[PDB]
Amino acid sequence: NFEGKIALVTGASRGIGRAIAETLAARGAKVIGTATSENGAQAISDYLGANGKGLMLNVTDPASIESVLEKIRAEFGEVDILVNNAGITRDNLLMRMKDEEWNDIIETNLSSVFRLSKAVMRAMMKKRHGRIITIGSVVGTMGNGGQANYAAAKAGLIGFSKSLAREVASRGITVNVVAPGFIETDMTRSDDQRAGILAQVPAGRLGGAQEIANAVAFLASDEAAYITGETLHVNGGMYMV
Amino acid sequence: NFEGKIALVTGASRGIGRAIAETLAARGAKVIGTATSENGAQAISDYLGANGKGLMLNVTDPASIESVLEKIRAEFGEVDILVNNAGITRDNLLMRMKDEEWNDIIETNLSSVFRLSKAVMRAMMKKRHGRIITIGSVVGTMGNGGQANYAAAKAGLIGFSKSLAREVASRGITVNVVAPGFIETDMTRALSDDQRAGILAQVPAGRLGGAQEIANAVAFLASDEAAYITGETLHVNGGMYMV
Amino acid sequence: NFEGKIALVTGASRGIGRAIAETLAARGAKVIGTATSENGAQAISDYLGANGKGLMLNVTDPASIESVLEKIRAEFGEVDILVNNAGITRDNLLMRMKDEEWNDIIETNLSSVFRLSKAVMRAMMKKRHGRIITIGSVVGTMGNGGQANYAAAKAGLIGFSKSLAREVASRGITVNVVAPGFIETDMTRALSDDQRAGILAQVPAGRLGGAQEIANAVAFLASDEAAYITGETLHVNGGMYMV
Amino acid sequence: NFEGKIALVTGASRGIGRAIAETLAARGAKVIGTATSENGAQAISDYLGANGKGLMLNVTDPASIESVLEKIRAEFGEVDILVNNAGITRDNLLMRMKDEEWNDIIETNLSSVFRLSKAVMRAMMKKRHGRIITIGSVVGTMGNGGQANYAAAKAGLIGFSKSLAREVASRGITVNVVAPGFIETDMTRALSDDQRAGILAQVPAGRLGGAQEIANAVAFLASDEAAYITGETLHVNGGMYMV
Ligand SMILES: NC(=O)c1ccc[n+]([C@@H]2O[C@H](COP(=O)([O-])OP(=O)(O)OC[C@H]3O[C@@H](n4cnc5c(N)ncnc54)[C@H](OP(=O)(O)O)[C@@H]3O)[C@@H](O)[C@H]2O)c1
Ligand SMILES: NC(=O)c1ccc[n+]([C@@H]2O[C@H](COP(=O)([O-])OP(=O)(O)OC[C@H]3O[C@@H](n4cnc5c(N)ncnc54)[C@H](OP(=O)(O)O)[C@@H]3O)[C@@H](O)[C@H]2O)c1
Ligand SMILES: NC(=O)c1ccc[n+]([C@@H]2O[C@H](COP(=O)([O-])OP(=O)(O)OC[C@H]3O[C@@H](n4cnc5c(N)ncnc54)[C@H](OP(=O)(O)O)[C@@H]3O)[C@@H](O)[C@H]2O)c1
Ligand SMILES: NC(=O)c1ccc[n+]([C@@H]2O[C@H](COP(=O)([O-])OP(=O)(O)OC[C@H]3O[C@@H](n4cnc5c(N)ncnc54)[C@H](OP(=O)(O)O)[C@@H]3O)[C@@H](O)[C@H]2O)c1
Ligand SMILES: [Ca+2]
Ligand SMILES: [Ca+2]
Ligand SMILES: [Ca+2]
Ligand SMILES: [Ca+2]
Ligand SMILES: [Ca+2]
Ligand SMILES: [Ca+2]
Ligand SMILES: [Ca+2]
Ligand SMILES: [Ca+2]
Numbered sequence: 001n002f003e004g005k006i007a008l009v010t011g012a013s014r015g016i017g018r019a020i021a022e023t024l025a026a027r028g029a030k031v032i033g034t035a036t037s038e039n040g041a042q043a044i045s046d047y048l049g050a051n052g053k054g055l056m057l058n059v060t061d062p063a064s065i066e067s068v069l070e071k072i073r074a075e076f077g078e079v080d081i082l083v084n085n086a087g088i089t090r091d092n093l094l095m096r097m098k099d100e101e102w103n104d105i106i107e108t109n110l111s112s113v114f115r116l117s118k119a120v121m122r123a124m125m126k127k128r129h130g131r132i133i134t135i136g137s138v139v140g141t142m143g144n145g146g147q148a149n150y151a152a153a154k155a156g157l158i159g160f161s162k163s164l165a166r167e168v169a170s171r172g173i174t175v176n177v178v179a180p181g182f183i184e185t186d187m188t189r190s191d192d193q194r195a196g197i198l199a200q201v202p203a204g205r206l207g208g209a210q211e212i213a214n215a216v217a218f219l220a221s222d223e224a225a226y227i228t229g230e231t232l233h234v235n236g237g238m239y240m241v
Numbered sequence: 242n243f244e245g246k247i248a249l250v251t252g253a254s255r256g257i258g259r260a261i262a263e264t265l266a267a268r269g270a271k272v273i274g275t276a277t278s279e280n281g282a283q284a285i286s287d288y289l290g291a292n293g294k295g296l297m298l299n300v301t302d303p304a305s306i307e308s309v310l311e312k313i314r315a316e317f318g319e320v321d322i323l324v325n326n327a328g329i330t331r332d333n334l335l336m337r338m339k340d341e342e343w344n345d346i347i348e349t350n351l352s353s354v355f356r357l358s359k360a361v362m363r364a365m366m367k368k369r370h371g372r373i374i375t376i377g378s379v380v381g382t383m384g385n386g387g388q389a390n391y392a393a394a395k396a397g398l399i400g401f402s403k404s405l406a407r408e409v410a411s412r413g414i415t416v417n418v419v420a421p422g423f424i425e426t427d428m429t430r431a432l433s434d435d436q437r438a439g440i441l442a443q444v445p446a447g448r449l450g451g452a453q454e455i456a457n458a459v460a461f462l463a464s465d466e467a468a469y470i471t472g473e474t475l476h477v478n479g480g481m482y483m484v
Numbered sequence: 485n486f487e488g489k490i491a492l493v494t495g496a497s498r499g500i501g502r503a504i505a506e507t508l509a510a511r512g513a514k515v516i517g518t519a520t521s522e523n524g525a526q527a528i529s530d531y532l533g534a535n536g537k538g539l540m541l542n543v544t545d546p547a548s549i550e551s552v553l554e555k556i557r558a559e560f561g562e563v564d565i566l567v568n569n570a571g572i573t574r575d576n577l578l579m580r581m582k583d584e585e586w587n588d589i590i591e592t593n594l595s596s597v598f599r600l601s602k603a604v605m606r607a608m609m610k611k612r613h614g615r616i617i618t619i620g621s622v623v624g625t626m627g628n629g630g631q632a633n634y635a636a637a638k639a640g641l642i643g644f645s646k647s648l649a650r651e652v653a654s655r656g657i658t659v660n661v662v663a664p665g666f667i668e669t670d671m672t673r674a675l676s677d678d679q680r681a682g683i684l685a686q687v688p689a690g691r692l693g694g695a696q697e698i699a700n701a702v703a704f705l706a707s708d709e710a711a712y713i714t715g716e717t718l719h720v721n722g723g724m725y726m727v
Numbered sequence: 728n729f730e731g732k733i734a735l736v737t738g739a740s741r742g743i744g745r746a747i748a749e750t751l752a753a754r755g756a757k758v759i760g761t762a763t764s765e766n767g768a769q770a771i772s773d774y775l776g777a778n779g780k781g782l783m784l785n786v787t788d789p790a791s792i793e794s795v796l797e798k799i800r801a802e803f804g805e806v807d808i809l810v811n812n813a814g815i816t817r818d819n820l821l822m823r824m825k826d827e828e829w830n831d832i833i834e835t836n837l838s839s840v841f842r843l844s845k846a847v848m849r850a851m852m853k854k855r856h857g858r859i860i861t862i863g864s865v866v867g868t869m870g871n872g873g874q875a876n877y878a879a880a881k882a883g884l885i886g887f888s889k890s891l892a893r894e895v896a897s898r899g900i901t902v903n904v905v906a907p908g909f910i911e912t913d914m915t916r917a918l919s920d921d922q923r924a925g926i927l928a929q930v931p932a933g934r935l936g937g938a939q940e941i942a943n944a945v946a947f948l949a950s951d952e953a954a955y956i957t958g959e960t961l962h963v964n965g966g967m968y969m970v
Pocket of ligand 4: 737738739740741742743744761762763764767784785786787811812813814815835862863864865906907908909910911912
């Protein structure tokens with residue numbers, strides 16, 4: 001139960017992000033989910049109803065981050081739980097990877113974690129309590145051909161999380177990563193390609209967005225106060241470390 | 242909710258083991274906790290009350306294992322959740338470590354995982370559902386002077402868990418490890434402020450972990466909310482080590 | 485023996501970078517070491533002599549990268565061995581870390597690996613052989629207070645390397661990382677015995693590593709004796725961290 | 728150059744073990760390789776010639792250990808380099824794995840590392856220099872269906888190695904693990920093309936590894952060029968697994 005907690009979930013329009021937002025809300029938290037457009041934000045406001053609000057946010061833009069946080073502080077208060085879910089992909093074999101494909105991935109998937117974390121850190125340190133959870137990926141640990149950029153950012157946020165974790169652990173704040181394997185999403189939703197995927201998963205199936213949300217909710221709860229600088233893999237056995 | 246689930250927790254007399262047993266019971270599961278003596282088993286039956294029973298079990302003795310399981314089947318049924326918590330320590334620098342000190346740790350902390358997992362596996366495969374969770378240790382991952390035997394067993398059960406996880410993942414069965422860092426126990430409680438300081442210095446969180454904290458992690462992995470997690474090691478060490 | 489091989493070592497002015505350049509040269513390789521200034525580039529030409537050359541290179545500037553590669557091709561040929569050693573630190577606790585301190589570390593310590601690798605890849609693919617070795621850090625694996633930016637970069641370059649390794653493994657090209665622990669440098673040498681004691685206490689080996697020790701590891705991975713090693717991280721930290 | 732060093736390589740009859748023995752000998756070390764029978768021991772003496780000797784050893788019999796090290800001290804001296812290569816496999820899905828199969832793997836592949844390391848320990852600490860290298864396996868890190876026992880032993884030896892490394896690092900002794908992926912052996916050579924295809928599909932490198940490649944990695948770690956590497960696992964698997 002998160003009664004009295006304020007949670008910020010970036011990229012909460014659908015799939016994993018939305019499941020996370022709905023789950024925290026269903027458990028008593030006041031949730032602020034974000035999208036890159038005003039309409040996408042409004043749609044989040046629509047489903048969260050009285051348990052939260054949707055706001056437009058660009059994790060690559062310093063002014064946007066500052067604007068959203070002020071709005072959150074004026075209507076709800078300080079963020080207790082930060083879930084960095086915003087992310088994108090720009091696949092290509094190295095030789096075909098554009099400088100922009102690399103930079104956009106680093107900025108959106110890695111630098112965003114730095115920016116959002118620093119932005120909520122202060123209040124958590126004062127309150128001597130907080131949760132920062134970033135959605136990584138199995139790719140960050142095993143790497144993947146054609147996704148060197150995505151893997152760099154996903155592996156990068158782990159090193160960041162470990163360092164930040166060491167800086168704020170004594171003040172009741174945990175910093176962790178939930179690394180999903182293949183998750184059933186609109187994209188994976190025609191049938192010779194799904195089986196090429198299932199073949200890599202011992203569980204024999206794709207994970208559900210709600211399954212990632214359950215793991216996030218666990219780490220965000222008071223039941224995981226002694227877990228920090230840790231990566232929780234949720235991949236059906238696709239990879240094991 | 243564990244309603245209808247039967248859980249076997251080895252070494253449930255106190256600390257982590259007891260917290261795990263009480264937590265699963267409090268959430269609807271019929272729990273069978275074990276101890277190495279009949280008296281210890283009775284004390285477990287006492288705190289579990291109508292939600293479970295305590296049984297005497299020696300994880301290094303096949304006859305004991307089969308006998309215990311035969312009893313659980315008779316009174317409750319097949320085990321749905323297995324928590325391998327039984328474990329000991331026989332610390333010593335390698336140059337001093339006696340063969341018995343090495344062997345006893347291997348049999349009790351590693352071979353026991355093999356014996357108990359194999360003993361409840363068949364039924365799980367048939368139901369196409371199950372949970373096997375072993376309590377490891379940060380030591381199995383970072384190593385520790387004076388605990389080469391303990392570290393070998395704790396690291397070894399991870400390799401075992403990963404291998405088993407791959408064999409049964411398609412059958413709706415998950416096999417994981419929860420690796421505690423420094424947890425408060427009777428041993429640590431009686432340490433001196435000076436020694437506790439030596440321990441705390443290694444922990445970014447600045448405190449020892451609670452048995453209940455490990456139990457919460459175990460309960461999460463044992464639930465249906467962790468069906469997509471297998472062959473994984475969940476570290477609960479306050480930042481003492483990070484991988 | 486690297487006779488017949490052309491190696492590019494970024495940031496070879498001193499310490500680890502210079503040891504790497506001198507070691508590859510001593511073993512028969514034609515070495516091109518780089519620095520950020522003409523003077524630095526000259527110091528490198530000074531110690532490499534007839535076995536190589538120093539060039540000015542800014543790993544964050546595409547123009548510079550193209551210019552440098554063009555020069556190596558003109559005078560020496562295609563790069564067979566790439567050692568990404570260039571890097572910097574901009575330490576600070578998160579709340580005190582300026583955007584530019586984050587941006588600079590990411591561009592210099594991570595994006596640089598992407599840029600340089602991509603610039604030597606084609607020729608390697610064709611020759612069906614090559615070596616890409618990046619100097620990471622124990623910090624990339626264990627993390628470190630005050631170095632979240634540096635940690636993010638060193639951990640990210642591992643994720644990059646694993647991915648690249650998968651793309652080129654079938655073509656006789658290996659992509660690895662050598663992660664040093666505390667290495668002796670002019671800075672550490674200037675520390676008082678008390679200051680060093682804080683560092684030494686974190687290392688089981690009881691001493692700082694030698695720049696030459698990192699160079700030896702790099703030379704091993706760059707040789708033909710490590711053809712079956714790729715996407716791997718070789719830790720050289722005296723036991724400071726163990727994975 | 729290992730001139731003046733005495734190396735003990737267990738299970739040096741063929742494959743990885745023999746390559747290791749021949750490589751260390753070729754580089755100046757006096758090598759003692761072992762086999763489980765007198766004939767196998769003689770065959771090893773035959774190929775080592777004036778650079779070493781073959782001895783019959785059972786890494787599960789304490790008396791054999793004392794005896795073998797006894798002969799070694801008498802003829803050559805104290806062991807400076809220990810390579811734990813002896814090991815076996817007893818595959819089977821858990822549901823059908825025999826106690827003997829589990830116990831045999833644990834004793835031969837894990838407890839053996841403890842016994843031999845402990846036996847050569849004192850001499851090394853006294854001389855403030857030594858090398859202990861154990862041949863692990865990728866299966867120890869990734870685990871493998873049908874090899875829960877092999878995986879437990881292989882993962883367990885890393886936990887063991889990390890702990891011992893911590894106890895002896897300050898004394899100039901390093902303890903490491905070289906973890907091979909699929910290495911070409913007579914067993915793999917007899918597989919059908921369909922089977923080999925199954926294996927190759929798991930290796931980005933697109934080929935099986937060679938015994939000599941593992942030997943080169945072992946020789947590197949055993950040399951003075953790897954004195955700052957300890958408690959580390961060097962993966963040599965062609966990209967089969969990446970950590
Ligand atoms: N799907 C999988 O199998 C899988 C596996 C492992 C990890 N993940 C990770 O899980 C997370 C969810 O991504 P997804 O691909 O599953 O879902 P998705 O539907 O692609 O959602 C991405 C979300 O991020 C937001 N976003 C994109 N660029 C942004 C920017 N510059 N600033 C702020 N927000 C931005 C999007 O906003 P709009 O709604 O406005 O477009 C959207 O809400 C990602 O971090 C991803 O890397 C997914
Ligand atoms: N305390 C920590 O900080 C910490 C940290 C990491 C991991 N752990 C792990 O957590 C688990 C709990 O151990 P602990 O030391 O915390 O508690 P403990 O109080 O030592 O309890 C050990 C339990 O195991 C049982 N046991 C011992 N030998 C057995 C055998 N041969 N057969 C069956 N049961 C046996 C004991 O039975 P009796 O009650 O009959 O004696 C007791 O219930 C262990 O696996 C341990 O390695 C503990
Ligand atoms: N020292 C340690 O204990 C330790 C431990 C782990 C990892 N490392 C890593 O080892 C490597 C060596 O660094 P160091 O700190 O030991 O030595 P350093 O003396 O700081 O050398 C850094 C080198 O990188 C070059 N460089 C800096 N910014 C550059 C840029 N934008 N473009 C191109 N080159 C640039 C420098 O050029 P100039 O000579 O022109 O200044 C210099 O040659 C780094 O990647 C570092 O992260 C060091
Ligand atoms: N082949 C691979 O792909 C691969 C991959 C990863 C790791 N490995 C590891 O590499 C090592 C080499 O094994 P292998 O299978 O490749 O070669 P192998 O030809 O099976 O050789 C095994 C060696 O160990 C000795 N041995 C067996 N039981 C022993 C005992 N009780 N006491 C003393 N010595 C004993 C054997 O003696 P005899 O000659 O007298 O029979 C033989 O010399 C093993 O530790 C193995 O786990 C192999
Ligand atoms: Ca609302
Ligand atoms: Ca792929
Ligand atoms: Ca210790
Ligand atoms: Ca984990
Ligand atoms: Ca010149
Ligand atoms: Ca520190
Ligand atoms: Ca390694
Ligand atoms: Ca397999």
